[PDB]
Amino acid sequence: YEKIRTFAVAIVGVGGVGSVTAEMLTRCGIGKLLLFDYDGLSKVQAAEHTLRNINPDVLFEVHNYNITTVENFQHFMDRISNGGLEEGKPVDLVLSCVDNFEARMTINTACNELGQTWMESGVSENAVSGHIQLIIPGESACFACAPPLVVAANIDEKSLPTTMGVVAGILVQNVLKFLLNFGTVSFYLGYNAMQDFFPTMSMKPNPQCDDRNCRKQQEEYKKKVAALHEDNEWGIELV
Amino acid sequence: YEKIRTFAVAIVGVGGVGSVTAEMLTRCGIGKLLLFDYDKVELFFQPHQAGLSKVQAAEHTLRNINPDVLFEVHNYNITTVENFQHFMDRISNGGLEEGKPVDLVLSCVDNFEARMTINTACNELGQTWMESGVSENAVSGHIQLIIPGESACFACAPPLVVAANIDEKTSLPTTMGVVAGILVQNVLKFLLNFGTVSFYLGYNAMQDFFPTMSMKPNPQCDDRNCRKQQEEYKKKVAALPEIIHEDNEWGIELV
Amino acid sequence: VSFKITLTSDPRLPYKVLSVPESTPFTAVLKFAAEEFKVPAATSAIITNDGIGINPAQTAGNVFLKHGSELRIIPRDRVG
Amino acid sequence: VSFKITLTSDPRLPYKVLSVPESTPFTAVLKFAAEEFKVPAATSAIITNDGIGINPAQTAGNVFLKHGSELRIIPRDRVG
Numbered sequence A: 001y002e003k004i005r006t007f008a009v010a011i012v013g014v015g016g017v018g019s020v021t022a023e024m025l026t027r028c029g030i031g032k033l034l035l036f037d038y039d040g041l042s043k044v045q046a047a048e049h050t051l052r053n054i055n056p057d058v059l060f061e062v063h064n065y066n067i068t069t070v071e072n073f074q075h076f077m078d079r080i081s082n083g084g085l086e087e088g089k090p091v092d093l094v095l096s097c098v099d100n101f102e103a104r105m106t107i108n109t110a111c112n113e114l115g116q117t118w119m120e121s122g123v124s125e126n127a128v129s130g131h132i133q134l135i136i137p138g139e140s141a142c143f144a145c146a147p148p149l150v151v152a153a154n155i156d157e158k159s160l161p162t163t164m165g166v167v168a169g170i171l172v173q174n175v176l177k178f179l180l181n182f183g184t185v186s187f188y189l190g191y192n193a194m195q196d197f198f199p200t201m202s203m204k205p206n207p208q209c210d211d212r213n214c215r216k217q218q219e220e221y222k223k224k225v226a227a228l229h230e231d232n233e234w235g236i237e238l239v
Numbered sequence B: 001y002e003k004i005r006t007f008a009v010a011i012v013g014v015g016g017v018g019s020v021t022a023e024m025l026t027r028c029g030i031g032k033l034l035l036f037d038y039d040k041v042e043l044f045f046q047p048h049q050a051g052l053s054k055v056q057a058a059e060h061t062l063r064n065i066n067p068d069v070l071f072e073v074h075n076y077n078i079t080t081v082e083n084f085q086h087f088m089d090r091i092s093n094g095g096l097e098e099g100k101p102v103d104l105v106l107s108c109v110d111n112f113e114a115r116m117t118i119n120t121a122c123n124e125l126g127q128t129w130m131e132s133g134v135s136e137n138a139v140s141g142h143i144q145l146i147i148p149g150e151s152a153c154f155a156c157a158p159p160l161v162v163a164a165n166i167d168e169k170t171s172l173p174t175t176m177g178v179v180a181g182i183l184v185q186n187v188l189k190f191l192l193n194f195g196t197v198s199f200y201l202g203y204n205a206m207q208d209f210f211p212t213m214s215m216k217p218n219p220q221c222d223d224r225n226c227r228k229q230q231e232e233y234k235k236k237v238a239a240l241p242e243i244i245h246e247d248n249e250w251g252i253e254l255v
Numbered sequence C, D: 001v002s003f004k005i006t007l008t009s010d011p012r013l014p015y016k017v018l019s020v021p022e023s024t025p026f027t028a029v030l031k032f033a034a035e036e037f038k039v040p041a042a043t044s045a046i047i048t049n050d051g052i053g054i055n056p057a058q059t060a061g062n063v064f065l066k067h068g069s070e071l072r073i074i075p076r077d078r079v080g
């Protein structure tokens, strides 16, 4: 549907999953993409150049910096809040396609503060596993609600093309269903490539999440909830 | 595993699904691709390539993505009498080593006639192939593994229009990307023998439902070579022949 | 003869039970079942509970005799 | 003191039953369970049967008191 041109999506990380994700949304005629990544051109600029030719009608804004530094982080939040299709309005979705937990925690911290819905994606090191997850701050679990062991233990973080293509495809399908409101949106969709198992789940916020802005968005969510046969010549009988 | 370089795959149809399928296998380092398509590029492909045949534009792009992959392409309609016989010749002898068959045929065509043509060819040859499809409305798709004689061929369970011999009278990028990724994953598992190969894997995009099943041959299939491969399969079957815990000072008991 | 036909492409696995004269061509039964499911009849195919493919171009009587009552519709998606 | 931990990423949904002293940090329980499942401990996370996320950096006693026995490991895939 042509209402797709009305939306803007930010993509963090234009590697394997993120670049396929960006191409798919460009071919769908998304109104605007924002691309964030950190390094000839930079990755975000090379991506922008190819995507512009695929669909000249899509608007692009790109940024080559590390969002996990203090000065760039505030800029990151500024563009989530005001870099929507109309300048001054937020983007309709953030997509996380980064390849470490620190950057996911940074996006999570930003979106919890802003009340910004995003989707997170991942692929396992050995390429036989991946997933997507929908994070509506306050309504579904944020990334800090269920931290991976290495994050919770404060330890330092010290076949690929097929799995990346599957994960990007299901990510963008979930984007389309969320934005255009058809079908059923998955709050979690896993991919086990070894056994072709695609578990769905719905992950819930922890009331004592470490991220205090997750907690505050949980309070606001609860407040908002509280506020409301052309023929048949044969004689076939359904029974 | 670099055993992937020892195999050759034929792809029929280099459209939405087929072109992504071809790119993925190129990036994986497949030994050889054979590409079959009758249509031109019209406006995976690129603007300046409009007007070339699809197989040649694909070959031009894929060669430079991976110079180690071998390519053979054919720009013709496989359902015509002269081209059909050439098609079978190249399935049988266009493998990585000339004179050997391809290890797999992939059907990425967009009509039932062409799938029936591939089906007829592979049953005669005893050639394993996988078929893929995407629904008109783009919210559904599937892949299917056809080992002639062992699993159902495309004629074992024909769609209604084919069985009634009626003439084929009657969001896309996302669904195609899923189907191709799912197709090539099954190719890798089949060729490199890791994981579980799906004989059928469906995709329901509306509800994120991915049914698997295993479809079996019809003993009275219309395709006579399906029936004969069923007999051969039965004769062939009759003829065959850890847990370390880096520390545990806490007293956690498995129970 | 009676058939229980399940739609494999729906997570709910919904089914329809159809009662039909023996001489009815099963192509008409498949069409009727697809219409009840509101999936396209033209691209629908039919298998047994064991997964054996069926060519619907035979009588409902013969489908029952050969395969029994419990059948499953699978899509045959046509685009590449 | 005791937990049943289910691996959500395996279609068989296998589980392990662990008995553990109240004072053990649950991070060690999660690691032990992942090792029994032969999945990577570092990227594993844990939720309740209801799907509520859990921060493992607390005592097993406190996890049990707050959430009970029935827990589920989910992968946290790290690449893009």
Ligand SMILES: Nc1ncnc2c1ncn2[C@@H]1O[C@H](COP(=O)(O)O)[C@@H](O)[C@H]1O
Pocket: B012, B013, B014, B015, B016, B017, B018, B036, B037, B038, B039, B054, B076, B077, B078, B079, B108, B109, B110, B111, B114, C079, C080
């Ligand atoms: N008989 C045939 N021989 C060769 N290519 C075909 C035949 N029928 C369909 N195709 C191709 O299959 C591809 C499917 O396109 P799509 O529907 O975009 O996946 C198109 O590029 C068609 O040209």
Ligand SMILES: [Zn+2]
Pocket: A141, A142, A143, A144, A145, A146, A205, A206, A209, A210, A211, A214, A215
């Ligand atoms: Zn949280």
Ligand SMILES: [Zn+2]
Pocket: B152, B153, B154, B155, B156, B157, B217, B218, B221, B222, B223, B226, B227
């Ligand atoms: Zn057959």
